[PDB]
Structure formats: structure tokens, C-alpha cells
Amino acid sequence: VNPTVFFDIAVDGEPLGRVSFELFADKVPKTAENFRALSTGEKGFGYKGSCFHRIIPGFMCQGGDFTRHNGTGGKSIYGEKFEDENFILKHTGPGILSMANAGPNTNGSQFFICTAKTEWLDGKHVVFGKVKEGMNIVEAMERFGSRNGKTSKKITIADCGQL
């Protein structure tokens, strides 16, 4: 059975709500496992306390850079980077969870939650989960973004784990 993980989101330290995600371990097991373990922190590092550094309304919310907090950092549980596992799943609409990258085979810890259909990313970014509960909370987060992606308040993962 596919794992479910949660993020409790805060805005300038104030609780906003919870978003949960189904991870598609049945189709992208290596990529799902990376996100799962980073969400429980069981390897000794992970997403708890990290921020969403880039939020563009009508496109995506990007996070997962727990080492440099700005899009230049992060690392996977397999090392600094890992390969594109497959591209079976596509960017079909809001709620899709997909890996950020900087070229072929450069997955780390950064990810994005789509808030629109982003079909031009198909075959370039590995899709590995979807929002299960709390899409309304993603929509609320999105309002703190801007056209250039800077956030008007600090959006953090106050807690996270596996359900």
C-alpha cells in the first residue's frame, strides 16, 4: 500500500494547516522512498523546519532545500544526487508532486507541488505523488507567493512525518 506523508505548514510561525500526500511507491519506488524518509527524518536529516522558498501563483510551490534554504541546496538519501527513475506519470493538474532538478539525473531533495497543469515538464521531471488531503491549504499557501516566486511571509514545514 502506497505510503502517506503529512506536512504541517506555518506562516511566519503561525499554524496554517496540514497537507497530506500519497506517494506512488508502486510506480516510482526509489523516488517515493527518498521523499518518505526525508519526511520522517529517519536518516538524520530531512524536511522538518525547512521552507517553501519559491511560490508562483498559478504555477507551483517549491520547497525541499533544507541545506541552503533558497533553491541551491539539498541532498537525497542516496547521496547528493540520483537518477531520473522513470517518467511514467505526468503533470496532469493541480496537486501533482514532482522532483525539481538542474539537468538530467540530478534529483536531490527539492520538489514542487503543482497548482496548475504543467505538461511541458512531462518527461523532464519525475512525478512521484499527489496531494491527498488539504489541497485547500496548498491554495492558501499559494496566496503568499508572487510572480517572481518570492514569498510575502515565511512558509515553513513546522512538522512532517508518515501517517
Curated annotation (Swiss-Prot):
Result of changing K124R: Loss of acetylation and interaction with TARDBP
Matches recorded under Pfam families: Pro_isomerase (PF00160)
Effect recorded for F59A: Loss of ability to stimulate MAPK/ERK phosphorylation
Catalytic activity: [protein]-peptidylproline (omega=180) = [protein]-peptidylproline (omega=0)
Alphabetized Gene3D superfamilies for the sequence: Cyclophilin-like (2.40.100.10)
Residues with Phosphoserine modification: S76
Cross-link type Glycyl lysine isopeptide (Lys-Gly) (interchain with G-Cter in SUMO2), residue numbers: K27, K81
Keyword entries, A-Z: Acetylation, Apoptosis, Cytoplasm, Glycoprotein, Host-virus interaction, Isomerase, Isopeptide bond, Nucleus, Phosphoprotein, Rotamase, Secreted, Ubl conjugation
Gene Ontology biological process terms in this record: activation of protein kinase B activity; apoptotic process; cell adhesion molecule production; cellular response to oxidative stress; endothelial cell activation; leukocyte chemotaxis; lipid droplet organization; negative regulation of oxidative stress-induced intrinsic apoptotic signaling pathway
Gene Ontology molecular functions: cyclosporin A binding; heparan sulfate binding; integrin binding; peptidyl-prolyl cis-trans isomerase activity; RNA binding; unfolded protein binding; virion binding
Cellular component GO terms held in the UniProt record: cytoplasm; cytosol; extracellular exosome; extracellular region; extracellular space; ficolin-1-rich granule lumen; focal adhesion; membrane
PTM field: Acetylation at Lys-124 markedly inhibits catalysis of cis to trans isomerization and stabilizes cis rather than trans forms of the HIV-1 capsid. PPIA acetylation also antagonizes the immunosuppressive effects of cyclosporine by inhibiting the sequential steps of cyclosporine binding and calcineurin inhibition. Acetylation at Lys-124 favors its interaction with TARDBP.
Residues linked to a glycan: N107
EC number(s) recorded for this UniProt protein: 5.2.1.8
Cross-link position per record: Glycyl lysine isopeptide (Lys-Gly) (interchain with G-Cter in ubiquitin): K27
UniProt modified residues of type Phosphothreonine: T92
Impact upon substituting H125A: Loss of peptidyl-prolyl cis-trans isomerase activity and interaction with HCV NS5A. Loss of ability to stimulate MAPK/ERK phosphorylation
Domain PPIase cyclophilin-type stretches: 6-162
InterPro entries named among the record's database cross-references: Cyclophilin-like_dom_sf (IPR029000), Cyclophilin-type_PPIase (IPR024936), Cyclophilin-type_PPIase_CS (IPR020892), Cyclophilin-type_PPIase_dom (IPR002130)
Assigned protein family: Belongs to the cyclophilin-type PPIase family. PPIase A subfamily.
Purpose: Catalyzes the cis-trans isomerization of proline imidic peptide bonds in oligopeptides. Exerts a strong chemotactic effect on leukocytes partly through activation of one of its membrane receptors BSG/CD147, initiating a signaling cascade that culminates in MAPK/ERK activation. Activates endothelial cells (ECs) in a pro-inflammatory manner by stimulating activation of NF-kappa-B and ERK, JNK and p38 MAP-kinases and by inducing expression of adhesion molecules including SELE and VCAM1.
Assembly and oligomerization: Interacts with protein phosphatase PPP3CA/calcineurin A. Interacts with PRPF19 isoform 2 (via N-terminus). Interacts with isoform 2 of BSG/CD147. Interacts with FOXO1; the interaction promotes FOXO1 dephosphorylation, nuclear accumulation and transcriptional activity. Interacts with integrin ITGA2B:ITGB3; the interaction is ROS and peptidyl-prolyl cis-trans isomerase (PPIase) activity-dependent and is increased in the presence of thrombin. Interacts with MAP3K5. (Microbial infection) Interacts with HIV-1 capsid protein.
Name of this chain's protein: Peptidyl-prolyl cis-trans isomerase A
Gene from which this protein is expressed: PPIA
